[PDB]
Design a protein around this nucleic acid. Structure first.
Lengths: 180, 176
DNA sequence: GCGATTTCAAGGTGAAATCGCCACG
DNA sequence: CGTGGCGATTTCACCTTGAAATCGC
């Protein structure tokens, strides 16, 4: 029952759950402690998105999940939010795959961000302060690509960028605005 | 005409000559040189929007200079104007009735139009990517400096997910 | 009351620190 | 001798677990 992720146990536990089963019962039908079945589902609930940032989910501990699945809903638990956060930490994150250490610290590292960054974006959510995430980082001094969401308003800002790009963007933005 | 003279005389400005001298190496009244030079100044990206440059007057160059100013003067905001009206320029350039001067006049009047509103929503240049009847629902494009941005507001999440996704690749594709 | 969840004490575990044993100048 | 090497051991800090206390209706 462990070769694979508390999560895959969870997959099962839900399949039954979904079928009308109380954990108290599943625990029975499977031979698991009511207390584990909590945990196995508790984990099988973790925000797929976040879970997907880590290299060795196998190194992902439940308590982590508990806070991973915690950050999940404490951040609206909606596509556009998870999407945004990733963007933010992703740079510093892959930056963590450059750097020695074992699966142990990398885990604690990646999550450090998922929490801090998410807890930095959550600030301007009630504070309703404009939040920007740099879409791409340039070695350059004056070049930038970034997004800024300050409420229900949001913009895509670019500087010193190709003409091939204003070209493309302009084209696709205008046609997507046709589509809807 | 006067422009050409300008650009030519220009070479001599940088030749390190004073107008007074150039107004002699060309037996041109010095007033004339001032005027040629001022003309030589108008935005090349606008002067070349006229099929018959021979027909732009001084005051025309003079007011192209103007439009050019009022709008910062950098290429990217020109292209911004130059595309917004380019259809109606190739358009008017299809009309057969009107005489050549009627052409420049119509084209010039076009060029002044853009300048006024694009710099009203600003310096910067802002074109309305789309018009929503709501006092606070917009989707636009903005240029100023060598920097452009697509500003939106009060739109569906779905819209934002797509653009986000799209733009996502459009960069990934090229920054690579 | 009654599931579900968290708490508690009792085991695991791995990474890092220490230890053993050795072989070499 | 005095050392450095390096595979095995132990430490230590964090896990997981079931049971039983606790929660939250």
């Amino acid at each position: 029952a462990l070769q694979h992720s508390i999560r895959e146990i969870g997959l099962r536990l839900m399949r039954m759950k979904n079928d009308g089963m109380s954990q108290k019962d599943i625990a029975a039908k499977e031979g698991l402690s009511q207390a584990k079945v909590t945990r196995a589902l508790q984990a099988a609930s973790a925000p797929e998105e976040l879970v997907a940032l880590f290299p060795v989910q196998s190194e992902l501990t439940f308590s982590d999940y508990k806070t991973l699945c915690a950050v999940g809903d404490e951040m609206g638990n909606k596509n556009l939010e998870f999407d945004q956060l990733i963007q933010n930490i992703s740079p510093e994150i892959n930056d963590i795959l450059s750097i020695e250490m074992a699966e142990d610290e990398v885990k604690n590292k990646i999550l450090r961000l998922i929490t801090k960054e998410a807890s930095l974006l959550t600030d301007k959510g009630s504070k309703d302060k404009s939040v920007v995430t740099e879409l791409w980082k340039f070695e350059d001094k004056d070049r930038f690509a970034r997004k800024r969401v300050k409420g229900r308003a949001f913009s895509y800002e670019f500087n010193r960028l190709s003409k091939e790009l204003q070209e493309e963007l302009d084209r696709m933005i205008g046609h997507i605005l046709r589509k809807s």
